[PDB]
């Protein structure tokens, strides 16, 4: 050990280390600053950058050994506190640049030394830094990062006051459709909102701390777990498996089809009989600190069996492949699609033709945070599990009858959150953490390190793909065939779910009156299939948009053009007969128009022998909601100190549930004028809260956004004043009147899919919208750059345009990753952020443009839609497209990795 | 396990807690504040006061389950931090009210919260306040901390300006004699000066956890020790005994004299065969946590025959008592006084002789901070202990041959550290760490709770007194003769020296020409002595100060003027034949006797017949160093940066060793016009600072601060450039010259006490002074309070005035407790502060009054001498002949408990 004296956030610390610890776990563990926050724990995304003598370093890469006697440290923390904001964090509360704000901390104390060094940087400065200090972001799409770096700098330079960092409240008032900040954002940009591996260091003592005995095997039967040495080892409590699961140690997809094959139960909570994918957790280590519990939980030994794995979909759906879950075949659903008459004849006597044959992948998610959870017994004799749940009610029962609790024993609350991007509509670590807190009585917590992220928990499942189109020479689609196969891993949950979606959104944005098509799902060995933002509408429409480029350049025309000429008017139907809500897509098109020729000359004149540009489109649609007649529930409640509650289990992913709350309400709220900063959100908890539903689905604009504004209307009712005017708390507790009133709403007239025909009205509410990609081909490489990105958006109303500019610009960034890089398909890999191809800053463009062009929806809360998907749907389709225009090749199977564009180029 | 979602600090927290957990271990472990100070643990002390809900409750006896949801915490964090201090914060730091500084937060808080009650206090509200809160201190004597509170009252109040509360310079510039604020203030009022306990929270997951196993008997021999049952207790590594010492596992007294007839190795590290007192470590349980090290210790059985305990002097003394250490006599040391012609003669035909029979108790020294250390195996291969002790050269050789280490592979470091008032002169738990340090090779802590304080430090060592003077009818002292008793307890260290202290301070003050006293030091079973404030003089001076009363009493002379006739004037010697080095009791006298003379006429007008008042004398005298030739040394450096650090080992129980430091420096340094704020102390390390001696005999200020005055002059004279004026850093390196400078200093011609006579010449320098206590007695209850006290002092010259005043204030206040209250007989009973007899406000009057009458010392520098130990002389004496002025009855035996007086005044 060694004693080091230095100074952290200005306060000389007297400090006692070993010089081969790390310096994240010194400042957060022995120095309680969990402000520095640490995710991939490898040096690659700068969630732990600090500045260590004038330099921006990664805490969790630097040794104790490198921090000299004397050395002056500066976590978030030393940047500024609430009320006492730093010029960076301003800026970043007032661009809306903490979205999660899991990387908020990271990245403002690496821009506060990028601004001791440099302190007027170009926007390419700023980049250039980011990049080179790893600073990466899943939320944002960094454009608004570096537009509050830019502000901060002008301030800090005297060029503007640093007033001008606060926000102008727009004086009719009306917060809906502004750049209100979100309530969250000043305990993100401070380091001061704790998620939940912060939270278990801020656990007591009695705390036991969880490590995984995980499957390093594929597929195997389960002979026998010798727990012997790891009893021995230091701190160890105990070993957790199956035998202590008090209930059915299954896990229930809930809602699985009628027509699935599959019982919906094939899911343990810690495998008896068998591994199904590499990662399965078959025990549980309990000790007095992470480190102990992952030493010994490598000493545990498991006897197996390995047994052959499928790793794909056409392997595992192979007419003599050996069923997985012995008794249901390993295809175990299928939704045809029959809209109109037979294809086969139109087909043949059509002008025109196209086919295609489509690949996308195993997308990983990569939130900056990787899975957490924690759970204890209740002084009242619940079990509580706090954890990133974004369907906390939904969890609850897709659990509790494994865990062996009724569901009036378990509490589960969502912790705040870095990020999930819809593997969270899944649980993860829920049951695990439930089960070890009931088999020891003692609060347990599990923190999974980022190779666990990547190859243990789901991930979007891979689409094989063909798809056809039959039209007219003047370009009208008369017909359209499709077949797909949905790799879902081994687990089952909302997997046949999955595959309607290819139902609904192939060829989603077009009048299409005959469809003939069919989707199947599959169980395989690789890893299990969690909603990844777009929840099949990136699969589906890659294929359609992609054959819709194929179908322009087949009959000579432009692409945007044949989706002018295809898409949605009045009197069409979508591809399960029901009739678009409202009708933007033309309108977009006519205002994109000229920009999308604006960029084809430039792409001309700026391409050059070895470096061609092009210029790419799509169409992107998906609805806003759960399919059939979704619904939710608020409650406004009046407190005595005049403050307003809304309380709602809206799940944040770090979306913006916290301002969709205070925005929809404030707007619902007008007529008795009260100001946003009274009005309180509430953290979804399953006792305490409504079942607002899951977010999942882009639904809890529309949906919630809804109920709050019932709720918050029949509040106004309940206030009133007879002769005008509204009572006081204090005039309606002396009156013995409530205070603490209920909304609910439902998406009457939605109707769910037929098992048949495919055929129903699943949404209320979709989001539309069309994208451009640019892009430079360097044909030398088959290296692909994105210079701009472009999405026309019909949201119907913005609720809150910082939050939906910045889930626009995350989708788009996404969208790179899916064309260019991204991918789960190698385990070892693929389970580190550069090893699966996250988008660093330099891959995402500084040009990202959004035009809203917003048509008020029927059912929206004041003509809102959902955004959270849309952004997601096809901007992969438009790169791959643009990809084409720049150089002749198509990419039918994401992603567009160099090689690949090369081979192309080159045959 | 619960859920509280509060605010602690105006920052929300999502709390996880167990219901019945101590709100002073969530703030402090789960959340790190460990601004939270923690001494008593019993609700008693106030250190761990807390702001909840508007109340200040001691956070140490508030169970979570009282905590409610949305609950208001503030602890000092929340107060203001450094460059955001509170107006409270900086009137402490202007006042000096911080000395160690462990009861600055929890008074400043509790401070807070009167003051957002009682904008407008008077003084007796801030008193009462402190008292309703359980607010104490051991270092200031409160009237300190009550000035602060009412300057930061003023203030707040709009009454004067906050800048008003900065230190304003002199502007000669001289901070040698101002009120300049010490260096380390600022740290400890906003609870950023980690404390040992603090260091402990803040150590790294190795560290293992030390409890005591302790012997429940007070003599003994040891047959076993059974660690089984320990052993395999939540959490435990292993169990420390004698076994796994690698030295002698024997303290060594160092200095024992050669007339001492035991041999100085008497003390264990571990006890091997025998217990010799209660409290004795036999064993260390070393664990994950101390609550966990604690549970097991409990378990550890040891196999004792319990032997007769000897527990006092007159007992353990007694002819035929048994050995408690085989082959040494318990009376193992003997001090003779033999000055001028025999005694008996000049008794027989004196015109008045008086004698009595005096005792003072088993004082404990009652820091707020309980003992704390610990160690670990550098990576250099050497053992570091960092610790309270006040002596680091001194403890390291005491030890090293005990725990099997040569002296330049142990390295010991003083801590910040919240009071000794001597108990650190002697090691406590330095050996146990180290030992456990060595055998297990991992970092080491060890934290006592208050009983162990209590029973398991060292005390004031109880002297039985005999004293006897003879005069002429003038009042003129012919001849003393003198016994004392001195009860050490077991272990030997320094008891010789002590007792000693007899025959150099009873009687001193006086012309005495003819004097014959011995001195004998006993070994008990009581509690081992070690130094306490005064050492040695609280004991001889009460003897003959209460003695120069009753001769005043027998002469019908008034007792002021008996002392006037008697004190010091050139020509006289002290009791050792030495000259005095300065003459200013006639002059404090005569400055002091209006004053007394008034205190007499109002003690007649206010008494009534139930409360009867009276006024007190007496006559303090301490030697400011260590015996002999002492000596010191500092190093001087001038730093690159242009600061000047002075290197020393003047180790700070809180007493101010930085300002001493500084204010020395500057004085010295003021010819190159060097900035306080540019001046740097270091602290005590024996590796990296020299040896500048212990901080006991009242000495650094006169051995180091003259070494650090030669230091300061030889790096002027390293500066000097030819022509005049000072080279810069810069300009000396460039020529290769000497930028660490040494300076050393010695007390040459002071002499050692001679072993047969007594006779010597032992400290160059002494400090002189004279007080007066106003009482008033309950006559029906016998129960003393003090009014007043005031204190002339010669301190030669002030190195810093808010230091000096502290000093003497606090010195005041233990003086009251050693009169009235204090002691520690009862092992249980005594063992908690109340139980002891800790003076809370209330028991300290606010008028305490100090009178500067300074006659600079030829010897110390810039004229000065210590302070330390001057005020707790015999202020205790002037008391308890105020209470006899008061009532007519003498109390001879310490304290003057109530029951004690009453039968004295009914017999
Ligand atoms: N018009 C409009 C719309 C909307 N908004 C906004 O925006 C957001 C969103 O919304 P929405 O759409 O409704 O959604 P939500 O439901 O809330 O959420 C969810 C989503 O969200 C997204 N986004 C995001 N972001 C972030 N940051 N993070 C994340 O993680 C995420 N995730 C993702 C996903 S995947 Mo799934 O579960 O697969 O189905 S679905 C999803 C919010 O805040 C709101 O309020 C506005 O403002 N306006
Ligand atoms: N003239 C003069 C003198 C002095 N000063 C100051 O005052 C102080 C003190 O000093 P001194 O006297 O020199 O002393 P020191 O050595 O440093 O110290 C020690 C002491 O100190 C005291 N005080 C105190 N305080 C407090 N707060 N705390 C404590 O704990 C204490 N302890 C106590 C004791 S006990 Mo022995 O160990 O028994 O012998 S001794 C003793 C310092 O700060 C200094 O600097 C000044 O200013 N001036
Ligand atoms: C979609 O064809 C069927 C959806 C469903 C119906 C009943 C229960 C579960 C899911
Ligand atoms: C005082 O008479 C003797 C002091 C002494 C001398 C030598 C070594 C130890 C102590
Ligand atoms: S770079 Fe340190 S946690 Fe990712
Ligand atoms: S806001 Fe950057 S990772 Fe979520
Ligand atoms: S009153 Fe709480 S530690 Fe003393
Ligand atoms: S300053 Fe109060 S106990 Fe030391
Ligand atoms: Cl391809
Ligand atoms: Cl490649
Ligand atoms: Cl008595
Ligand atoms: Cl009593
Ligand atoms: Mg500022
Ligand atoms: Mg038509
Ligand atoms: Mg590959
Ligand atoms: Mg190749
Ligand atoms: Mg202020
Ligand atoms: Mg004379
Ligand atoms: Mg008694
Ligand atoms: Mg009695």
Redesign the pocket.
């Given at each position: 050990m060694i004693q080091k004296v230095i100074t952290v956030n200005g306060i000389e610390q007297n400090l006692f280390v070993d010089a081969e610890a790390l310096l994240s776990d010194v400042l957060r563990q022995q120095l309680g600053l969990t402000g520095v926050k640490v995710g991939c724990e490898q040096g690659q995304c700068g969630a732990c950058s600090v500045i260590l003598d004038g330099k921006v370093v990664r805490a969790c890469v630097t040794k104790m050994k490198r921090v000299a006697d004397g050395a002056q440290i500066t976590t978030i923390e030393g940047v500024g506190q609430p009320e006492n904001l730093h010029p960076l964090q301003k800026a970043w509360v007032l661009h809306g640049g903490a979205?999660?704000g899991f990387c908020s901390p990271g990245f403002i104390v690496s821009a506060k030394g990028l601004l001791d060094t440099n302190a007027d940087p170009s926007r390419e400065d700023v980049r250039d830094w980011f990049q080179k200090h790893r600073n990466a972001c899943?939320?944002?799409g960094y454009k608004p990062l570096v537009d509050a770096v830019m502000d901060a700098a002008a301030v800090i330079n005297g060029k503007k006051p640093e007033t001008d960092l606060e926000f102008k409240m727009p004086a009719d008032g009306r917060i809906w459709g502004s750049k209100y900040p979100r309530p969250t954002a000043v305990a993100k940009v401070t380091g001061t909102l704790d998620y939940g591996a912060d939270l278990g260091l801020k656990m007591p003592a009695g705390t036991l701390h969880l490590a995984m005995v995980q499957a390093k095997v594929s597929h195997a039967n389960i002979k026998g777990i010798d727990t012997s040495e790891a009893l021995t080892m230091p701190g160890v409590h105990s070993v957790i498996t199956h035998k202590d699961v008090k209930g059915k140690n299954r896990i229930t997809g809930l809602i699985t089809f009628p027509t699935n094959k599959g019982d919906g139960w094939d899911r343990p909570i810690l495998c008896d009989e068998k591994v199904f994918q590499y990662g399965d957790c078959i025990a549980l280590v309990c000790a007095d600190s992470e480190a102990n519990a992952r030493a010994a939980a490598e000493k545990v030994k498991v006897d197996l069996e390995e047994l052959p794995a499928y790793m794909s979909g056409p392997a595992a759906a192979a007419e003599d492949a050996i069923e997985i879950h012995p008794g249901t075949p390993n295809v175990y659903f299928e939704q045809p699609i029959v809209k109109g008459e037979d294809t086969g004849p139109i087909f043949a006597s059509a002008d025109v033709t196209v086919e295609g044959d489509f690949y996308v992948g195993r997308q990983p998610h990569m939130?900056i945070e990787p899975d957490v959870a924690f759970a204890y017994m209740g002084d009242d004799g619940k079990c509580y599990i706090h954890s990133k749940s974004?369907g906390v009610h939904l969890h609850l029962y897709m659990i509790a009858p494994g865990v062996g609790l009724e569901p009036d024993q378990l509490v589960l609350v969502a912790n705040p959150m870095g990020?999930?991007?819809?593997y969270?509509?899944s649980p993860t670590s829920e049951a695990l953490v439930a089960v070890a807190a009931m088999a020891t009585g003692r609060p347990v917590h599990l923190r999974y390190n980022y190779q666990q992220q990547q190859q243990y928990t789901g991930k979007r499942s891979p689409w094989e793909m063909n798809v056809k189109f039959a039209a007219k020479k003047d370009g009208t689609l008369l017909a359209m065939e499709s077949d797909w196969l949905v790799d879902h891993g081994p687990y089952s949950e909302f997997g046949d779910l999955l595959t309607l979606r290819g139902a609904q959104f192939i060829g989603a944005g077009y009048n299409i009156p005959n469809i003939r098509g069919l989707g199947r799902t599959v169980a395989t060995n690789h890893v299990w299939g969690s909603?990844?933002?777009?929840?099949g509408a990136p699969q589906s429409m890659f294929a359609s948009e992609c054959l819709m480029d194929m179908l322009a350049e087949k009959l000579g025309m432009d692409p945007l053009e044949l989706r002018y000429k295809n898409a949605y008017r009045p009197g069409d139907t979508n591809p399960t007969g029901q009739e678009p809500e409202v009708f933007s897509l033309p309108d977009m098109i006519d205002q994109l128009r000229p920009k999308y020729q604006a960029a084809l000359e430039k792409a001309q004149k700026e391409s050059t022998a070895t470096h061609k540009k092009g210029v790419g489109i799509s169409i992107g649609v998906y609805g806003?909601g759960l399919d059939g007649p979704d619904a939710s529930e608020a409650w406004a409640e009046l407190n005595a100190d005049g403050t307003i509650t809304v309380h709602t289990a809206?799940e944040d992913?770090?979306?913006?549930?916290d301002?969709?709350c205070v925005?929809?309400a404030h707007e619902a709220l007008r007529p008795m004028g009260v100001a946003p900063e009274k009005i309180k959100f509430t953290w979804p908890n399953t006792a305490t809260t409504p079942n607002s539903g899951?977010?999942?689905?882009?639904?809890?604009?529309?949906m919630?956004?809804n109920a709050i504004r019932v709720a918050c209307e029949n509040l106004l009712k309940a206030c009133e004043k007879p002769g005008g005017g509204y009572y006081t708390y204090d005039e309606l507790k002396a009156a013995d009147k409530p205070t603490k009133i209920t909304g609910n709403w439902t998406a009457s007239g939605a109707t769910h899919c037929d098992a048949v025909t495919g055929l129903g009205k699943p949404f209320v509410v979709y989001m539309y919208g069309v994208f451009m990609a640019e892009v430079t081909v360097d044909v030398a490489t088959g290296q692909t750059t994105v210079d701009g990105m472009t999405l026309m958006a019909d949201?119907?109303?913005?609720?809150?345009?910082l939050?939906?500019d910045?889930?626009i610009y995350?989708?788009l960034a996404q969208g790179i990753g899916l064309a260019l890089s991204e991918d789960f398909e190698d385990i070892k890999k693929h389970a580190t952020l550069v090893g699966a191809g996250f988008p660093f800053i330099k891959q995402i463009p500084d040009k990202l443009d959004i035009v809203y062009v917003n048509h008020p929806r029927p059912d929206?809360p004041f003509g809102?839609?959902?955004?959270?998907?849309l952004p997601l749907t096809s901007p992969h389709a438009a790169i791959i497209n643009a990809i084409k225009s720049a150089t002749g090749v198509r990419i039918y199977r994401l992603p567009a990795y160099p090689e690949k564009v090369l081979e192309a180029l080159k045959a």
């Open positions: 979205q999660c899943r939320c944002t939130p974004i990020g999930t991007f819809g969270k509509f909603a990844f933002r777009g929840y806003s809206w992913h770090g979306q913006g549930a301002i969709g925005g929809t899951p977010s999942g689905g882009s639904r809890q604009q529309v919630t956004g949201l119907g109303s913005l609720c809150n345009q939050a939906t910045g889930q995350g989708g929206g809102a839609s959902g955004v959270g998907e």
